[PDB]
């Protein structure tokens, strides 16, 4: 079933319930996932109205871009030319600059295919918006099916050569409560390398580091507490994890990561080369979710995209988007429940 | 009473009914007026769903900007610097460029004051959007009261020196049917001068011309047919009217224009210096409004703003907006019945 209701400020809340009784809900404010629940429990972090997102934290569950992550000095080179993007975190451009796409009301259309339902969100980024050449016509399709698969498919076309590398910013928390650390979750991740950060500004350090046999090796399932209790300088630096991990094998068919808590597990699939993992290292901030004060480590992201830092480490990839080329990306979050 | 429902594509329709039974409705798609009815008759032009606007004509009833009208070659000078804006009509920048504010979903909040209900729409134009320096935090408040006054109040603040001169693109048609020409309407307008256009590209000619005693003189009420039938060069150029009229006396207290049909009149008040009048000179295009094919001259606008062309004719005004300075503008359309005797036949 599908239900649409007012979510505040003119935004809509679109709720999808599949054959299994699982409910997922989105908002056009930022083409974003708001909730995901099973047997009354929330699997992800989210607020109860549009206003909360705007007042508390506008990132959770949102489509972020045009470029996801931090860009050093807000500088990108396009067709050999330097362009300075909006700077919203010191001199860096984080998640596309201030008042970006995650804060706009996108238009949308719902398509019911029975076993699957799709919600197609659309937005036009005008040429020059926040320094980005365009216009960029963007669409994000969130779908949900009877096999409990939540899929995100991105598409874009630009009138001019530009840069494009968005991501989905959902935070998972299988405890179903923000006041509870994810340290008890088990994580598996098919990546042998990571991208260290230079310092507290969080720009990339410049190198690619092998993590095999370190507190960050999750090639083999492991509990989060291990990473959290590690003394690696990179962990210590951010007080948790806040880094890009480089996937060993690319392809949408491979399960790239798996998050588990008891009989409940989330599998991640993507066609992207990296996953940025951030463990809600907010200290005592205590943002409130459903009346519960969030704790440090009270959430974890799986941001699938081209790794941030390619401006300094070209090996990571290239986020350019040439005029007239069609950009496509797909990320899938699959939910499973262990039957005894 | 206030009612709200989905209008399509994620937009909503906000319908207000005042104590007199008059109803007016808006959409957050372009902070736009959708309809205004009296006794079941549409006073303006509008569509039945959001998709129609996007597919047929996105301007009607919308809030347009950041700069309303045509800017020659898209070139503006801001604080001694030349900036080129998005050009969407040949080398011209028309109504803020392509995919502008009239095409966006604005957020909104409704405030019920009892005798007056306000609908405040908000949007942020990011710095650099379509060439405009920013960011620009904008808000448009549309309100309707028990006195049948529909008021539009604009507000804006920029982080950077920029240009700002938006307007509201409503089209009236007191016949209540798009397929009926407004040549049968009576028009009174307190303006002695106008701004002629250079040619078919519609950029300004460079001069201001006195129109007293011409077919464009509406200081004393006359039927619109007088203008439509004129062979004055400017009328022929655009096949009707599509010009800025310079108001003789400024001030929100003065009735600047009055449009009448039989027992119904719409009065126009504004704090702006000119009114751009466009009479839907679409020829045989025939866009469908409520299943009626719109006729040439099937509608008329009263876009109150600073006149377009100030880039070339400095005397028209200055639309610059300094960083941190608060912009404000107010325009009011009021509805009356039996204001005067208007009994004609076409
Ligand atoms: O999740 C939103 C963002 O929050 C923080 O800024 C993290 O440093 C960043 O890596 C993450 O993507
Ligand atoms: O109605 C919106 C606009 O339509 C046409 O482009 C007219 O030339 C212009 O003056 C008018 O304001
Ligand atoms: Na809505």
TrEMBL record, chain A:
Residues annotated to bind beta-D-galactose 3: 70, 95, 242, 303
Task: Cite a single GO BP annotation.
Answer: galactose catabolic process via UDP-galactose, Leloir pathway
Positions annotated to bind beta-D-galactose 2:
70, 95, 169, 242
Q: Which Gene3D superfamilies match?
A: 2.70.98.10
Which amino acids does the record list as binding beta-D-galactose? 169-171, 242
Task: Name the residues that bind alpha-D-galactose.
Answer: 70, 95, 169, 202, 242, 303
- According to its UniProt record, in which pathway does this protein act? Carbohydrate metabolism; hexose metabolism
Q: What class of enzyme is it?
A: isomerase
What InterPro entries does this protein map onto? Ald_epimerase_bac, Aldose_1-epimerase, Aldose_1/G6P_1-epimerase, Gal_mutarotase_sf_dom, Galactose_mutarotase-like, GH-type_carb-bd
Gene Ontology MF terms in the entry:
aldose 1-epimerase activity; carbohydrate binding
**GO cellular component terms attached to this protein's record:** cytoplasm
Q: Which UniProt keywords apply?
A: Carbohydrate metabolism, Isomerase
The UniProt entry, under Pfam families, shows: Aldose_epim
Which residues are listed as membrane-spanning?
none
User: What domain of life?
Assistant: Bacteria
EC number, UniProt record? 5.1.3.3
Q: Per UniProt, where does beta-D-galactose 1 bind?
A: 70, 95, 202, 303
Record's catalysed reaction(s): alpha-D-glucose = beta-D-glucose
List, from the UniProt record, the residues annotated as the active site of this protein.
Answer: 169 (proton donor), 303 (proton acceptor)
Family stated for the protein in its record? Belongs to the aldose epimerase family.
Q: List the PANTHER family.
A: ALDOSE-1-EPIMERASE (PTHR10091), GALACTOSE MUTAROTASE (PTHR10091:SF0)
Protein name, as recorded: Aldose 1-epimerase
The species this protein was found in: Lactococcus lactis
UniProt lists the gene as galM
């Amino acid at each position: 079933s599908i239900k649409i209701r007012d979510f505040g400020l003119g935004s809509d809340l679109i709720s999808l319930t599949n054959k299994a009784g699982v409910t997922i809900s989105f908002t056009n404010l930022g083409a974003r996932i708001v909730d995901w629940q099973k047997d009354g429990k929330h699997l992800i972090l989210g607020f109860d109205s549009a206003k909360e997102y705007l007042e508390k934290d506008a990132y959770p569950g949102a489509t972020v871009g045009p470029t996801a992550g931090r860009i050093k000095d807000g500088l990108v080179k396009i067709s050999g030319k330097d362009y300075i993007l909006n700077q919203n975190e010191g001199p860096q451009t984080l998640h596309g600059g201030e008042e970006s796409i995650h804060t706009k009301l996108w238009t949308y259309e719902v398509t019911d295919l029975g076993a699957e339902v799709q919600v197609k969100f659309s937005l036009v980024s005008n040429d020059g918006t926040n320094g980005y050449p365009g216009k960029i016509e963007m669409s994000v399709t969130h779908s949900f099916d009877d096999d409990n698969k939540w899929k995100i498919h991105y598409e874009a076309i630009s009138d001019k050569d530009t840069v494009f590398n968005p991501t989905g910013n959902v935070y998972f928390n299988l405890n179903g409560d923000a006041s509870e650390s994810v340290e008890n979750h088990g994580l598996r991740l098919a990546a042998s390398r990571f991208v260290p950060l230079k310092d507290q500004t969080e720009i990339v350090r410049g190198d690619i580091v092998d993590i095999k046999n370190t507190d960050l090796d999750f090639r083999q399932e492991k509990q989060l507490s291990n990473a959290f209790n590690s003394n690696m300088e990179q962990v210590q630096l951010v007080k948790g994890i806040d880094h890009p991990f480089l996937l060993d094998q690319l392809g949408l068919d491979k399960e790239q990561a798996r998050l588990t808590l008891d009989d409940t597990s989330i599998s991640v699939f993507t066609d992207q080369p990296s996953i940025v993992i951030f463990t809600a290292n907010f200290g005592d901030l205590g943002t409130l979710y459903h009346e519960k004060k969030q704790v440090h480590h009270g959430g974890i992201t799986f941001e699938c995209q081209v790794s941030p830092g390619s401006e300094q480490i070209p090996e990571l990839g290239d986020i350019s988007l040439k005029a007239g080329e069609k950009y496509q990306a797909t990320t899938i979050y699959s939910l499973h429940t262990k039957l005894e």
